[PDB]
Enzyme design. Sequence first.
Site, short mmCIF file in Angstrom:
data_model
loop_
_atom_site.label_atom_id
_atom_site.label_comp_id
_atom_site.label_asym_id
_atom_site.label_seq_id
_atom_site.Cartn_x
_atom_site.Cartn_y
_atom_site.Cartn_z
N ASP A 172 -7.22 -7.50 19.28
CA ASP A 172 -7.50 -6.10 19.03
C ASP A 172 -8.87 -5.95 18.36
O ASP A 172 -9.28 -6.78 17.55
CB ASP A 172 -6.41 -5.48 18.15
N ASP A 223 -12.91 -10.11 15.42
CA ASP A 223 -12.86 -11.51 15.85
C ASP A 223 -13.44 -11.69 17.25
O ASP A 223 -12.81 -12.29 18.12
CB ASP A 223 -11.43 -12.02 15.77
N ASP A 258 -3.06 -12.29 18.82
CA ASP A 258 -3.42 -11.94 17.45
C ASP A 258 -2.47 -10.84 17.00
O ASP A 258 -2.48 -9.75 17.56
CB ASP A 258 -4.87 -11.47 17.38
#
Length: 1100
Positions: free
Chosen positions: A801, A805, A452
Site C-alpha cells: 500500500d 516502501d 504488507d
Amino acid sequence: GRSSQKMRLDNDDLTIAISGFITNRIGFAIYIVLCVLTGGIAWLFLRWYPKYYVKLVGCATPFRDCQWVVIEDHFNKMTILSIRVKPYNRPLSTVFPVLRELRSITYCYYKFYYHPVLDKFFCCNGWKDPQWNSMQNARSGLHGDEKAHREAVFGPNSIDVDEQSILQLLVSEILTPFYAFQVFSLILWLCDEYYYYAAAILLISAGSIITSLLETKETRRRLREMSRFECEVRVFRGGFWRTFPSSDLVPGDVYEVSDPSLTQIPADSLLLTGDCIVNESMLTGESVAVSKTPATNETLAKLNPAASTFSHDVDKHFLYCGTKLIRARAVALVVRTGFNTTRGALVRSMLVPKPSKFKFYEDSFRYLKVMGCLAGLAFIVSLVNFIRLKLHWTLILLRALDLLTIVVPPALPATLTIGTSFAVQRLKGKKIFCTSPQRVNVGGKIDLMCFDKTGTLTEEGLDVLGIRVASRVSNRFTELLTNVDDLTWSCKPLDPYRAALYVMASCHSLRIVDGVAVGDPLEVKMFEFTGWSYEEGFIAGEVISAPPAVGVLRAFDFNPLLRRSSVIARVVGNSGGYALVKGSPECMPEICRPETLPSDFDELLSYYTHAGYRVIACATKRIPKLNLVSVNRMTRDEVESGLDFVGFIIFENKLKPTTTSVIKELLSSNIGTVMITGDNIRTAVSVARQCGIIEEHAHCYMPRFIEGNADDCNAKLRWESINNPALELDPWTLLPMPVIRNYAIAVTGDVFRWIVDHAPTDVLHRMLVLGKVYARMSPDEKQELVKKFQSIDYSCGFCGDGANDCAALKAADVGISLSEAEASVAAPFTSQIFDIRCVPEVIREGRASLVTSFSCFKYMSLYSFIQFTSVSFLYVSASNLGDFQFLYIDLMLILPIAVFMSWAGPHSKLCAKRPVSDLVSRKVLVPLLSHVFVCVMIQALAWVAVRQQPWYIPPIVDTEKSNIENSENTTLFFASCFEYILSGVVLNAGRPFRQSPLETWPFLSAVAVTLIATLLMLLVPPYWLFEFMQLTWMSWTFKITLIAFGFVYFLIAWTGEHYLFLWLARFLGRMRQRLFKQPKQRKLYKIVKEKLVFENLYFQ
C-alpha cells in the site's frame, strides 16, 4: 604509484573497480579524422563498445591527477565522467597539513574523494570534519563564510536525480545498434524502389521511439517528484537567524525544530535542547508517535555516522530525514547532508542501474545477432552466386544486401511489443494502470508474491471486534455479542453495558467538519458503534428500534505517556454513568480495586496480547454525587485514586473481505505468498492465520536470542513455537525436534539482519525458503529480503500500500502499488481498487502476455526463415519476389496477423502451471527449428512440383533488371503466403494461458480475411491483379495442388506443435545427459525445498 583500486561499495549488491586512465593523447585528432569521416565509428560503434575507445585515446596513469576517469562495475559496463576541480579545502578531516585541488567524482550518486597523502579514493563520509567540540560551540552555530567552504565539498540537502535533457535521452535511445540497422534497412528499401513498407516501418519505429521516450521521461518525472522537497527553515546560526530555504544549509548548521511552518524534518539532526514528537511512517515503518529527548554531551562526543546502522541509545538523540512531525513540541544541529543521509542512502539504491533479470528482450536480440551471423554467410553465398551469372554491380549489391535484411527482420522487436501493449490496455480497462510495460511479461514468471499488512491486505484503520464486560455478579466472563445488551441483565447503581457505551465517546477530544471526525484514528472508530454518537450539544440521535439519553461535560485528552483519562459529568439521574475512565491494562489493574477484579484481568489480557489484538481498559471511578457544581476544577491526581476497571474494549486489524479468496487462489495456483510488515509479530501471525498464509493448525516458530548473547557477531538462536512452546528447532538444520507438520517459520526484523550479517548460508537459505511472516521489518530490510529472494532464484513480486516502501516495489520483479494513480511513485504497477484482487489480474495478464510474446517471436522468426527460403530458392536464377508481392507479405500477412494474434485475453482461471520464460531452452528453439524445417520442406516440394509441369516458364537470368514473371516465382509466392497464414494459425496460443481462438473473434476474422483474399488471388484473380503483382498462368489442378500443399503443411505443423515437437524436445532432454551428464542446476529455492522436504524430514 598505484593505478587501479578494486573495492566493494558499502552496499553488498554493488561492486566497482575504479581505474584511473589518462586524459587523451596527441592521437585524438587522428582519432577524430579517422573515425568521423565515415560517420559510423566514433559516435556509434565506440559508444556501444567503450572497451576499445578507452584503449585508444588513453594509455595509463597511476597518478590520479587526470581530467577524466573511467568506472568499471561488476556487470562489465563502463561509463566515463570527468574530474571536478575545487580551489581550497585545508582540513584533512574533511576527507577523513593542508590540501589543495581536491579530486572527486560522483558515480551513481556515490561521491568518491581522492586523498593526496594516501593516494586513494574513499567513499566513506562518516567523520566529515565534525568540529562539534562542546555544547557551547554547538549552540553557537557556524560563523563566517566557512558554510560556503562546507557547501561545495558536500552540496545541499537536494537529492534530485540527474535530469537529463531531451537531447541526451534522444541520443541515448535512438542510437541503439538496432535502430542503426533499421536506418540501414530503410536506406536500402528507399534505394531499392520499396517505399510503402519502408514508410510503414518508419512510422512503426517512430511510434516505438515516442512511446519509449515518453515512458522514460515519465519515469524520471516520477523519480524526481518523489524525492524533491523544499521548505523555509528559520535558523542557521545562533546570532541573526532568518528564514532561508532548506536547500542551503551545510553540515554544521543549527535550526529550530519548533518553527510553526516546519511540518516535516528536512535533514537528520542531533537534538540540542527541548523534546520532540516525531512520526516514522515512511522510515522504519512505525506510525506510532515517537518521543525524542535532547542529546547529551557524552552521547554527542561518541558520534560515528559512518555506519548506516547504530546502537539504540544514539537513535533517541538525533532526528530522521524526511519524517513528519506529529506536533511541534526546540533546536537541533544537523549531522549530515545530501545523498549520504538515512533517507539519502535509501533513495540512492532506487537510482542504481537494475540488473535486468528478465532476459527475453536480450535473448531475442542475441538470436537476432545469430541470424545476422547466418545472414553474413547468406550474403557471401549470394554474392559469389551473382558473380557467376555476371549481373550489374548495383543490382548485385542491392539483392545481396537485401538478403541480409530479409534474414534479420527490422519489424521483430516492434512486433514483440504489441502483445504487451494490448495487455497494458486491458489492465487500464480493469482499473489498474501500469507504468513500465516491459515488467508485464515478468509478471508471467512470478514464483513468490510478498505482501504488507499495513494497508494492503488489511484495512488501514484499527477496527473494533467486540467488548468484554466486567460481570461483577458472576466472575466468569459472558460471551460477546457485538451489539447492545443494556436491558438484558442488571449485573441498581449502574450497568456495565451503559457505562462502557458512555465511555466509548467520553474521554477523547472529537469534533466534526463534514461527516467525519477530526480526532485521532484510535479513538475515532469507537463512536460509530451502536449508532448513538454524540458530538454537538449533549443529546444525540437514538435509533427507533428505551435507551437513556446521552450527555458529557469536562472533556479531556488521553495522554499516551501517562495512558490515563478521567471525565466526571452527570448524564442520567444523579448517580448513573457519572465517572468514565479510559486507560491501559498494563498498570491500572494494580491500581484497580481488588473486589471489582473477576480474576480474569491478567490471563485474558495475556491471551489477547498473544492474539495480537489491542486492549484498552474501561473504568468507572466510585465518586459520590455530592461533587457536582458549575465551577468545578479538580487536578487529575485527586480523581485518579481508585479507578476500578469495568470492561475491555478490543481493537484489531480487520482484513479485507476478499483477501482470503485471493490468498487461497494464489496458494492453489502454486505461487507462494509471504507477509513483510513492520508491526509486532503477535498480530502479523494472527492476520496470516486469518488470510491463509500460514495453514490452519500449523505451528509458528520464532527465533530468540535466549541460548546465546544479544547481538554483535556472537549469539545462539533458539527457535521456539508461538503456541505450545518448548518445541524447539535445530539452529543448524531448521527441523522440528521430535522430543509433515507445517513449520510456518516467522522471523523478526532485527534477527533477520543478524542472520543475513552472520549465519551459515544453508541456514539463511532454509529460513528464506521456509519464511512466511516477516514482522518489524524496515523498508531497508524489506528490500534486503527482496534481494535475498532474488538471490535464491525466486522471481518474487511486491504488493504494498502507498509509496513509503517503494524501494521494495522497485527492487522486486513486479511492484504492484495499491495507491492512487497520481499518488503512486516508483512502482511498475498501480491499482485504483484497494483490494488485493489485482494481483491475480496482474499475474494472469502477465502469463498471457508472456505466452503471446513468445508466440509472436516464434512467428516473426518463422516469417524471416520462410522469406529467406523463398528468396534463396529464387536467387539461384537471379530472380526474386515482386516489388508488390513483398509488400503484400510484409504488410497484409505478418503485421495484421501479428497484431490480431496478440489480441486475446487470458484464461479466467489461474492455472497451476507456469509458462516457459527462457528463449534459449530446448522447449522453445526445438519447435521453432522444426517449424523452420517443415516450412523449408513444403516450399522445396512446391518448387519441385512446379519444375516438372508441362506449362513451366523457366526463370531467365537478366543483368539490368531481375525478372519476376516466372513460374517458379508464383509457386514460391503462394506457398509462402499459405505458410505465413497457417503458421500464424498454428503458433497462436490456446486454452492453458490465453483465450481460446474460437472464443475470440478478431483473430479468426483476420485469418479468414487474409486466407480468402489469398485463395481468391490464387484461384480467380482479375486481369488488373496479374500485371500488378507479376503472377504467372498456372493449371487449375496445380492451384488445387498448391491448396493441398498448404493444407498438408497446416496439418503437419499443427500436429508437430501440439503432439510431436514437444516429444522431440523431451527426446533431446533425455539425450542431453548422454554427452554431458552434469545435471543442469534448477532454481535454488526448488533444490532447498525438495531437499528439506525429503532428506531432512525422512530422517526421523
